[PDB]
Curated annotation (Swiss-Prot):
Disruption phenotype: Early postnatal lethality caused by abnormal cornification. Mice survive until weaning and probably die from malnutrition resulting from hyperkeratosis in the esophagus and forestomach that cause gastric obstruction. Defects are caused by constitutive activation Nfe2l2/Nrf2, leading to constitutive expression of phase 2 detoxifying enzymes. Mice lacking both Nfe2l2/Nrf2 and Keap1 reverse the hyperkeratosis phenotype and are healthy and viable in normal conditions. Non-enzymatic covalent modifications of reactive cysteines by electrophile metabolites inactivate the BCR(KEAP1) complex. Accumulation of fumarate promotes the formation of cysteine S-succination (S-(2-succinyl)cysteine), leading to inactivate the BCR(KEAP1) complex and promote NFE2L2/NRF2 nuclear accumulation and activation. Nitric oxide-dependent 8-Nitro-cGMP formation promotes cysteine guanylation (S-cGMP-cysteine), leading to NFE2L2/NRF2 nuclear accumulation and activation. The gene is Keap1. Changing residue 58 to A: Impaired interaction with SQSTM1/p62. It is found in: Cytoplasm; Nucleus. Keywords: Cytoplasm, Kelch repeat, Nucleus, Repeat, S-nitrosylation, Thioether bond, Ubl conjugation, Ubl conjugation pathway. One of its GO terms (molecular function) is ubiquitin-like ligase-substrate adaptor activity. Changing residue 231 to A: Impaired interaction with SQSTM1/p62. It comes from the Eukaryota. Its main location: cytoplasm. This is Kelch-like ECH-associated protein 1. The lineage of its organism: Eukaryota, Metazoa, Chordata, Craniata, Vertebrata. The Kelch repeats mediate interaction with NFE2L2/NRF2, BPTF and PGAM5. KEAP1 contains reactive cysteine residues that act as sensors for endogenously produced and exogenously encountered small molecules, which react with sulfhydryl groups and modify the cysteine sensors, leading to impair ability of the BCR(KEAP1) complex to ubiquitinate target proteins. Belongs to the KEAP1 family. It comes from Mus musculus (Mouse).
Length: 289
């Protein structure tokens, strides 16, 4: 569609914000709050509905990992509960294939999931599928050519440079070439024939580096670094450009939104979020009403 939606996030505590940015005019619009605050969630879109998946409510009243799937209809500006996942998944990644949502990895307390499940909107049902070969929280996920990729994250002990691919017709995961950089909480998306991994945390520092995996050549190549180091950034693609939203730079919860032009191999600032935050869910769909 036409707007970049950012849902939830973290600053001091987990947030309920839903706001939409319009690249055509620079404008932000505040929309209906999530029913439950959450950070470390993912967003995605199916049939012009926006979905918020997993996360955790870090609050003064306590900390609750989320198994929730919630449905936002832009035509009505209302959130509806959808069926919950088998398990809470904080710092989750999601991918959409053929109108179905895959929920990948994430944590529940000290449990670091390798498990994966798939939601079918027409049935309002989740079903488990084959688990990843590695436990991954803070995992990045993207879809290219109807294959699902899980990239980086943290396995409970080490931050990971590894990545793997799920072949739905085989219900099977296989390792791909590892990244050149260890990354937990990177932004992962697809542009053209490449899976991009932007930023994240290597166990030491927040990263500004960006690298991309060419599915044909099976190699990762660095492109230009972002203007800001960031972990727990939101990422999405809007009209052939990658947008990265917020995150944490080791000092500040960023309001910076940056945009990547792959033809010039340059990042630039495009706007600021209305407030700095990390761990947001991001997706693109039609403008409301
Ligand atoms: C994902 C992640 C973990 C983390 O732990 C610490 C101590 N800092 C960070 C960060 O920026 O990002």
């Amino acid at each position: 569609g036409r707007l970049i939606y950012t849902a939830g996030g973290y600053f001091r505590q987990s947030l309920s914000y839903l706001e939409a940015y319009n690249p055509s005019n620079g404008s932000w619009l505040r929309l209906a709050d999530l029913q439950v605050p959450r950070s470390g969630l993912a967003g995605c879109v199916v049939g012009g509905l926006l979905y918020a998946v997993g996360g955790r409510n870090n609050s003064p009243d306590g900390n609750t990992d989320s198994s929730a799937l919630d449905c936002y209809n832009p035509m009505t500006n209302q959130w509806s509960p959808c069926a919950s996942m088998s398990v809470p998944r904080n710092r989750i990644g999601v991918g959409v294939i053929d109108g179905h949502i895959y929920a990948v990895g994430g944590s529940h307390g000290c449990i670091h999931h390798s498990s994966v499940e798939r939601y079918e909107p027409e049935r309002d049902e989740w079903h488990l599928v084959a688990p990843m070969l590695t436990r991954r929280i803070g995992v990045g996920v993207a879809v290219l050519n109807r294959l699902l990729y899980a990239v980086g994250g943290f396995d409970g002990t080490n931050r990971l440079n590894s990545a793997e691919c799920y072949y739905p017709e085989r219900n099977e995961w296989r390792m791909i070439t590892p990244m050149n950089t260890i990354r937990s909480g990177a932004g992962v998306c697809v542009l053209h024939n490449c899976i991009y991994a932007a930023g994240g945390y290597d166990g030491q520092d927040q990263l500004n580096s960006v690298e991309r995996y060419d599915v044909e050549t099976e190699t990762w190549t660095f492109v230009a670094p972002m203007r800001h180091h960031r972990s727990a950034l939101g990422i999405t693609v809007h009209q052939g450009k990658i947008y990265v939203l917020g995150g944490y730079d080791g000092h500040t919860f960023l309001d910076s939104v940056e945009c990547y032009d792959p033809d010039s191999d340059t990042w630039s600032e495009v706007t600021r979020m209305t407030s700095g935050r990390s761990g947001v869910g991001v997706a693109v769909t039609m403008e409301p009403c």
